[PDB]
Design an enzyme around this catalytic site. Structure first.
Site, PDB file in Angstrom:
ATOM      1  N   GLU A  66      11.537   2.736  -6.094  1.00 35.67           N
ATOM      2  CA  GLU A  66      11.461   2.214  -7.453  1.00 35.67           C
ATOM      3  C   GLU A  66      11.791   3.356  -8.413  1.00 35.67           C
ATOM      4  O   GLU A  66      11.298   4.474  -8.257  1.00 35.67           O
ATOM      5  CB  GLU A  66      10.062   1.655  -7.746  1.00 35.67           C
TER       6      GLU A  66
ATOM      7  N   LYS B 183       0.838  -1.186   0.000  1.00 36.92           N
ATOM      8  CA  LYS B 183       0.000   0.000   0.000  1.00 36.92           C
ATOM      9  C   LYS B 183       0.881   1.247   0.000  1.00 36.92           C
ATOM     10  O   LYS B 183       2.013   1.212   0.481  1.00 36.92           O
ATOM     11  CB  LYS B 183      -0.867  -0.007   1.262  1.00 36.92           C
TER      12      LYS B 183
ATOM     13  N   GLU C  77      -0.185   0.657 -16.632  1.00 34.41           N
ATOM     14  CA  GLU C  77      -0.471  -0.721 -16.250  1.00 34.41           C
ATOM     15  C   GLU C  77      -1.926  -1.091 -16.531  1.00 34.41           C
ATOM     16  O   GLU C  77      -2.820  -0.243 -16.465  1.00 34.41           O
ATOM     17  CB  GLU C  77      -0.159  -0.935 -14.759  1.00 34.41           C
TER      18      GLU C  77
ATOM     19  N   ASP D  45      14.183  -1.057  -3.341  1.00 32.41           N
ATOM     20  CA  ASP D  45      12.921  -1.437  -3.939  1.00 32.41           C
ATOM     21  C   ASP D  45      13.312  -2.353  -5.066  1.00 32.41           C
ATOM     22  O   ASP D  45      13.635  -1.894  -6.167  1.00 32.41           O
ATOM     23  CB  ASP D  45      12.151  -0.209  -4.422  1.00 32.41           C
ATOM     24  N   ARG D  46      13.308  -3.661  -4.818  1.00 29.81           N
ATOM     25  CA  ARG D  46      13.674  -4.686  -5.793  1.00 29.81           C
ATOM     26  C   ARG D  46      15.152  -4.969  -6.031  1.00 29.81           C
ATOM     27  O   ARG D  46      16.017  -4.113  -5.865  1.00 29.81           O
ATOM     28  CB  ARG D  46      12.995  -4.419  -7.138  1.00 29.81           C
TER      29      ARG D  46
ATOM     30  N   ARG E 198      -4.014   0.152  -6.723  1.00 27.60           N
ATOM     31  CA  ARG E 198      -2.755   0.854  -6.929  1.00 27.60           C
ATOM     32  C   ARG E 198      -2.053   0.502  -8.235  1.00 27.60           C
ATOM     33  O   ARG E 198      -0.920   0.030  -8.245  1.00 27.60           O
ATOM     34  CB  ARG E 198      -1.814   0.632  -5.737  1.00 27.60           C
TER      35      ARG E 198
ATOM     36  N   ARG F 111      -0.071   1.145 -11.634  1.00 22.48           N
ATOM     37  CA  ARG F 111       0.954   2.097 -12.015  1.00 22.48           C
ATOM     38  C   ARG F 111       0.652   2.678 -13.395  1.00 22.48           C
ATOM     39  O   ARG F 111      -0.170   2.140 -14.131  1.00 22.48           O
ATOM     40  CB  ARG F 111       2.319   1.416 -11.972  1.00 22.48           C
TER      41      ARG F 111
HETATM   42  C1  NCV Z   1      10.522  -4.951 -12.173  1.00 22.32           C
HETATM   43  C2  NCV Z   1       9.407  -5.144 -13.183  1.00 22.32           C
HETATM   44  C3  NCV Z   1       8.090  -4.883 -12.915  1.00 22.32           C
HETATM   45  C4  NCV Z   1       7.320  -4.366 -11.682  1.00 22.32           C
HETATM   46  C5  NCV Z   1       7.361  -2.906 -11.153  1.00 22.32           C
HETATM   47  C6  NCV Z   1       5.904  -2.408 -11.089  1.00 22.32           C
HETATM   48  O1  NCV Z   1       5.298  -2.416 -12.393  1.00 22.32           O
HETATM   49  C7  NCV Z   1       7.975  -2.867  -9.735  1.00 22.32           C
HETATM   50  O2  NCV Z   1       6.938  -3.063  -8.757  1.00 22.32           O
HETATM   51  N1  NCV Z   1       7.220  -5.147 -14.063  1.00 22.32           N
HETATM   52  C8  NCV Z   1       5.777  -4.898 -13.920  1.00 22.32           C
HETATM   53  C9  NCV Z   1       7.620  -5.628 -15.337  1.00 22.32           C
HETATM   54  O3  NCV Z   1       6.773  -5.806 -16.196  1.00 22.32           O
HETATM   55  N2  NCV Z   1       8.872  -5.874 -15.564  1.00 22.32           N
HETATM   56  C10 NCV Z   1       9.759  -5.664 -14.580  1.00 22.32           C
HETATM   57  O4  NCV Z   1      10.930  -5.898 -14.793  1.00 22.32           O
END
Ligand code: NCV
Ligand code: NCV
Lengths: 313, 309
Positions: B39, B18, B176, B113-114, B171, B173
């Site tokens: 991110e 969230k 998306e 973040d990742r 949520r 993006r």
């Molecule tokens: C890291 C990555 C992501 C995720 C991103 C959010 O959209 C991080 O939360 N995505 C959706 C992708 O489609 N390819 C990616 O490599």
């Protein structure tokens, strides 16, 4: 621990690299030297279908306005991933076997190209040809694997006229004089970049000198004659004229990866036997390394032979 | 001896948390002993390319509608993943030299973040499962996964699928599209990733168990290795080509040394934040390589956050 000599023959295609390498390999015993050939089978069938043809056709269509720059870019980016895969996996599995730099080597491994060919040089050339974005080039740069000790890279020198002639005669490839000029320029810049870094050059310090070839020898090159000059593209610059930090870090990586390489220049402007002997003489000053285990040597030979058999023409 | 560093990579399928959970993480990094590397959305939307996320989802959508071929989709997906992962790959490349061996209280804690595998393994594998990426490309990305350094603590999110759909829906993006098939794919990949690490840590040898995919640790069929039994990677006699087998050897190498921690997101933002802190006790810390490493890492982390949001 036995020693290993790794030699990566690279540089623009069409100069005689393959022939020269084969002739050199034909000089030694069966298992004292091994050749990791061009993974043509991977590019043509295993990784994708006719990758070379796809690349040349995409560039052609772009030059004809049949497709957009964005369309060409996605194709070239994806294609270069396929092109470099064999080099990348080979490096990754070889890495654990390489020790510090070290006297006859128990084994000599001659490679047809180094990972930077597909992760840096050709992408950079495609960039100059408008078929790849500079951001994609830097993404490839950031992915270049850590440079292993004893990375000896042999680049080639050949007059453009001779190069063009040699190419105008000898896959799915097409005769692109602009690409030849671009790849020749990129490899020239690459050689200067290595010399620049080994002479203590700091790109961050000389960046401002950026407004409007040989290694292991010569004075320090001007930054404008190195690969750093290619990344002054507006796409990479922030409103204040500076490089975005993300791209600047990619250049820091470029510097790190190249500075530890041992670059040599081979004059391909001679007969096949001539090139062979010149290359043989060149290997005398190359850096060997110890292997990490007693069984590393035989393992490496198997790896090379397996690679050659499966992905070599 | 050099100061200690604690690196934490918050990963897993996106959309489990969230906005308030993230702001708490930003709050966490308010103190100078902790930095939160958010991110790199700005990189994805503007710096690296234009609306990369939009491009990814539109491409899949068009593939599903049959507007484009699997090949056209794969070319787009592959290129887009390079853009997506660039910030992670460059960050790892510059940070790597500062990481020493395994190691009070860390002088510094970096919460990312990742991790690079998100863009170099997990999402690519999910797209493979969505028919929008070739398995050869996935293995090419895998072959480029940076060597796993000591102290690679990766936190993966756990959340019931229905609850995950609920949060993801609220949520989304930029660009998306709510794709339940993709949600299932990415959730499966991360489930398999967790199992894979355990499989490897318990001594599993993919080469020894390979025959089981066509015949105490997870069954290989429940690890990422099962995804690579893809026909495109096999010779006429069914054997996996050596180049791909080597890529799997690399995958095994990179994943085995990772320290996985599961964070239950099925709770409040404050609960998730507390759960994360609870998980840090078992995380592995490392020494840095130089006295100036800490300040440098701090600058790197802060600059990243400021420039790529
Ligand atoms: C890291 C990555 C992501 C995720 C991103 C959010 O959209 C991080 O939360 N995505 C959706 C992708 O489609 N390819 C990616 O490599
Ligand atoms: C290596 C390489 C090449 C060169 C090709 C031989 O002419 C294969 O060695 N090209 C054209 C590319 O477009 N990308 C590449 O990565």
């Amino acid at each position: 621990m036995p020693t290993l000599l790794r030699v990566y023959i690279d540089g623009p295609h069409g100069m005689g690299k393959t022939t020269t390498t084969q002739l050199l390999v034909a000089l030694g015993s069966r298992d004292d030297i091994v050749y990791v050939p061009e993974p043509m089978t991977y590019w043509r069938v295993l990784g994708a279908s006719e990758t070379i043809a796809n690349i040349y056709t995409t560039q052609h269509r772009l030059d004809q306005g049949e497709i957009s720059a964005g369309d060409a870019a996605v194709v070239m980016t994806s294609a270069q991933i396929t092109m470099g895969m064999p080099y990348a996996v080979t490096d990754a599995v070889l890495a654990p076997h390489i020790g510090g730099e070290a006297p006859p080597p128990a084994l000599t491994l001659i490679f047809d190209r180094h990972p930077i060919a597909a992760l840096l040089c050709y992408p950079a050339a495609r960039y100059l040809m408008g078929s790849m974005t500079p951001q994609a080039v830097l993404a490839f740069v950031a992915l270049i694997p850590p440079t292993l000790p004893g990375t000896n890279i042999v680049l080639g020198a050949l007059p453009e006229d001779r190069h063009i002639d040699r190419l105008a005669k000898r896959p799915g490839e097409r005769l692109d004089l602009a690409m030849l000029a671009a790849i020749r320029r990129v490899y020239g810049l690459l050689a200067n970049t290595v010399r620049y870094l080994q002479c203590g050059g700091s790109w961050r310090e000389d960046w401002g000198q950026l407004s409007g070839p040989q290694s292991n020898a010569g004075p320090r090159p001007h930054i404008g004659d190195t690969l750093f000059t290619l990344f002054r593209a507006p796409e990479l610059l922030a409103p204040n004229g500076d490089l975005y930090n993300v791209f600047a870090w990619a250049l820091d990586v470029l510097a790190k990866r190249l500075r530890s390489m041992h670059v040599f220049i081979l004059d391909y402007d001679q007969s096949p036997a001539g090139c062979r002997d010149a290359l043989l003489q060149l290997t005398s000053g190359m850096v060997q390394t110890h292997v990490t285990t007693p069984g590393s040597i035989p393992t490496i030979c198997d790896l090379a032979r397996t690679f050659a058999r499966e992905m070599g023409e």
